[PDB]
Write a protein that binds this ligand. Structure first.
Ligand code: HEM
Ligand code: HEM
Ligand SMILES: C=NCc1cncc(OCc2ccc3ccc(N)nc3c2)c1
Ligand SMILES: C=NCc1cncc(OCc2ccc3ccc(N)nc3c2)c1
Ligand SMILES: C=NCc1cncc(OCc2ccc3ccc(N)nc3c2)c1
Ligand SMILES: C[C@H](O)[C@H](O)[C@H]1CNc2nc(N)[nH]c(=O)c2N1
Ligand SMILES: C[C@H](O)[C@H](O)[C@H]1CNc2nc(N)[nH]c(=O)c2N1
Ligand SMILES: [Zn+2]
Lengths: 413, 408
């Protein structure tokens, strides 16, 4: 690897220099002969594997607090080593846990919202032992993060992996999501994305209302036990009915969405330790709801209906009726959230903030790994500043990782 | 190893074997992906490259290992010994040009790849000859609005001191003028080129849509100015099908996209001058050409005329104006019977193309960063399509601008 790699912004001519890539820890999937940057995704750590991953993290932490090579640094390394030697794992100090969580977010290449990385409330739930305990922790997370519409980013971290047979898992992909029900006639009610998980909930005992926007129950696995169902108290679930500033008929579509995006199926990796349940939340970029949740063909797929109500010629694709409808839907989303005073960010604001954040990272940190395929919004790409921004993608640690869906691996008791 | 790509919208899975053929580097390493970086001989070097090309040619016509195949390699070998290079047969030239387009990972238009009219201009010796060849290209490709794909291939590079070069980045572009008051008249992308034309004696009308003259370099010599005959330059006035005030914006564009600044590589040989042309995808004009900040930058003016609330970005006034401009562009070309493809149809065609390529070829190198249109990305099928990018040859490569190399 060369020491300096330069990126160019083709709109502003600004050139940044990256050195941070030298600390790349994992493989990307790409090789010198093939690029995999648009592939979506391209038994525990032994003692000897864990030692260097821990020292790498501990070093980085003490380097961050400007106490590298100190007595405290050396003493901590020594204590960590003893733990691994005699227990095959180790426990993070609170300060370290908070640092690592913030950094996994800071290192999340695919995240456009990372200007906020250092303001993250970290809830330490490593004392949890049961699914009921998990539910309590998760409810407290939702209430705090929701904050009556004034959303605050947060993560709740459950006990790390031990032997791999005692994993804590949130089976939900997000804390709050809508059910999908496949009908005998092939149609789908609710969100098609969630059909499989909804079925599982039903099998585990959930009585489904069978509506369009039914908040799914939590399915919570503690200590490797069978997962358990819990109903999130409805008063903790903030929702926004969607309407349009001009189109008075838009409200008649009966749409709404939840205010809190809380991803809960990812794995947090700190100094070799694996936190298999670590639900985190921020706030939405409008396009997540307006473009993806509503207009993806395999989701709510409302483009046609909105277009029909707009009386657009839907005969040629070249009338751009889809594109026209797409904008109005996204306008409704932003307007509906802002009117109800629920935190949301539009794609222009988010991408402009991210460019500023990225430049600051290049200047203070020596770079900022970024995944262009993900950073660029799913609408109006080239009229956002990130479209023209060259980015370098690479994997720093601590990090958020994908993990298999738990129902594919769970050993039923 | 075999590689799979999935479309997450349709769940279709393709298997890629073709990438096992590539020999060129992509820019990425195991530890760093550079997918969003815009730009990441000798007798000894030459022959292997030639062999590989000749080999795939004789393979493509089902005569791999034939007597003709062997004789050709031997012929190519002597010719490299005795002249330090070699010349392609006409058949090879055509096969190579079509394959460079086929292998062009960034091109969404590739379903058309084998419908390419190849003009052999390797007998050209002067800028005047270049101008004649280029006019013929333009007239044939334009075809009164029924655009037809074409490429004109000027002599290959020899010693590097005698390069043929089209100094224009496209055969047809509009001038850009650096105004006293700091602003820019016409097209900002071409400001530098325009000054060069002026510096070489071009008399600029100083309008907003002045067709630049051709600036042509033959056999390493100084470039020379030529005005394309105006009757050869098809243009479309932009109007809107609902907003009658749109035509008052005074916007037009040219019909023929004719990229003239790339390098065509075949069997080790380098063709530094190979103007090629197709037809436009509407977004090229309506999104990038009209709405980039460093381009015509008209979003404000349109949004003004649409009486949108431009005070907050979260009103999406930019996005709204963006769609209207792209409606106009498609409408205008269509009404003038000038070939154009909308980004929905273009992307659909490309998905169909990929399926074809995987089926008949074992893969299709594709650059998602470039294939996904610059607006309404996720409501086109390509957004949800996993692609593998890799470099096959023959290929189109980038080259330095000639005013950074040429000595006068
Ligand atoms: C505070 C406001 C935030 C905004 C506006 C934001 C925005 C986004 C968006 C738009 C995406 C792309 C999602 C998609 O299209 O599917 C994303 C991805 C991601 N975000 Fe953020 N985010 C925020 C907070 C956070 C926080 C608090 C974390 C973790 C602590 C986080 C970690 C991630 C990760 C790991 C991904 C990639 C997930 C994947 O690979 O599938 N983000 N973010
Ligand atoms: C026939 C209709 C065609 C359509 C609709 C089309 C469309 C496109 C578009 C939209 C791009 C992206 C350009 C940009 O956004 O700046 C592109 C790239 C490209 N096209 Fe095509 N194209 C066509 C024909 C051709 C032909 C005839 C050739 C060559 C013989 C070709 C070779 C290329 C190459 C090499 C690139 C990538 C340029 C680069 O790497 O910077 N295309 N095409
Ligand atoms: C299901 N699609 C792929 C996927 C997988 N696993 C997690 C995903 O979440 C994306 C994601 C992650 C974190 C986010 C934080 C805030 C926010 N507004 N969106 C966010 C979106 C997406
Ligand atoms: C450039 N001349 C020297 C040279 C260098 N490197 C390779 C060479 O091979 C010549 C050559 C000639 C005929 C061939 C026929 C078949 C074949 N497989 N290789 C063949 C190779 C010759
Ligand atoms: C400005 N973007 C970078 C760039 C530089 N140099 C050449 C480029 O070519 C873009 C390109 C290439 C071939 C095309 C063929 C047809 C078409 N409609 N557009 C096409 C657009 C692009
Ligand atoms: C195939 C492709 O990688 C996939 O559809 C990606 C593209 N870019 C994306 N970008 C974001 N922000 N979110 C996504 O889900 C995706 N999906
Ligand atoms: C940073 C990035 O590589 C650059 O802006 C690219 C992005 N994608 C693109 N895609 C297309 N089709 N054309 C372009 O010029 C670009 N520019
Ligand atoms: Zn890559």
């Amino acid at each position: 690897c060369p020491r300096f790699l330069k990126v160019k912004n083709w709109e502003t001519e600004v050139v940044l220099t990256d050195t941070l890539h030298l600390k790349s820890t994992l493989e990307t999937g790409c090789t010198e002969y093939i690029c995999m940057g648009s592939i979506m995704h391209p038994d525990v750590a032994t003692k000897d594997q864990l030692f260097p991953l821990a020292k790498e993290f501990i070093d980085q932490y003490y380097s961050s607090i400007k106490r590298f090579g100190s007595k405290a640094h050396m003493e901590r390394l020594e204590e960590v080593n003893k733990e691994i030697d005699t227990t095959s794992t180790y426990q993070l100090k609170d300060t370290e846990l908070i640092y690592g969580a913030k950094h996994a977010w800071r290192n999340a290449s695919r995240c456009v919202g990372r200007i906020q990385w250092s303001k993250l409330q970290v809830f330490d739930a490593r004392d949890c032992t049961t699914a009921h305990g998990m539910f309590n922790y998760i409810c407290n997370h939702v209430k705090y993060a929701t904050n009556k519409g004034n959303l605050r980013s947060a993560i709740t971290i459950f006990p790390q992996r031990t032997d791999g047979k005692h994993d804590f898992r949130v089976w939900n992909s997000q804390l709050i999501r809508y059910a999908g029900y496949k009908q005998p006639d092939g149609s789908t009610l609710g969100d098609p994305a969630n059909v499989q998980f909804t079925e599982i909930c039903i099998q585990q005992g959930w009585k489904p209302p069978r509506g369009r926007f039914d908040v799914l129950p939590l399915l919570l696995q503690a200590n490797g036990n069978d997962p358990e169902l819990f109903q999130i108290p409805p008063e903790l679930v903030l929702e926004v009915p969607i309407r349009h500033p001009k189109f008075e008929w838009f409200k008649d579509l009966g749409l709404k969405w939840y205010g809190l995006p809380a991803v809960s199926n990812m794995l947090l990796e700190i100094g070799g330790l694996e936190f298999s349940a670590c639900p985190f939340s921020g706030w939405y970029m409008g396009t997540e709801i307006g473009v993806r949740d509503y207009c993806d063909n395999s989701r709510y797929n409302i483009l046609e209906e909105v277009a029909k109500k707009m009386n657009l010629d839907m005969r040629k694709t070249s009338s751009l009726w889809k594109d026209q409808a797409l904008v109005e839907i996204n306008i409704a989303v932003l307007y509906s959230f802002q009117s109800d005073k629920v935190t949301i960010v539009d794609h222009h604001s988010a991408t402009e903030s991210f460019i500023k954040h990225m430049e600051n990272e290049y200047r203070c940190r020596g770079g900022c790994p970024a995944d262009w395929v993900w950073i660029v919004p799913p609408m109006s790409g080239s009229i956002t500043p990130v479209f023209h921004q060259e980015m370098l993608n690479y994997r720093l640690t601590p990090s958020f990782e994908y993990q298999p869906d738990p129902w594919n691996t769970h050993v039923w008791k």
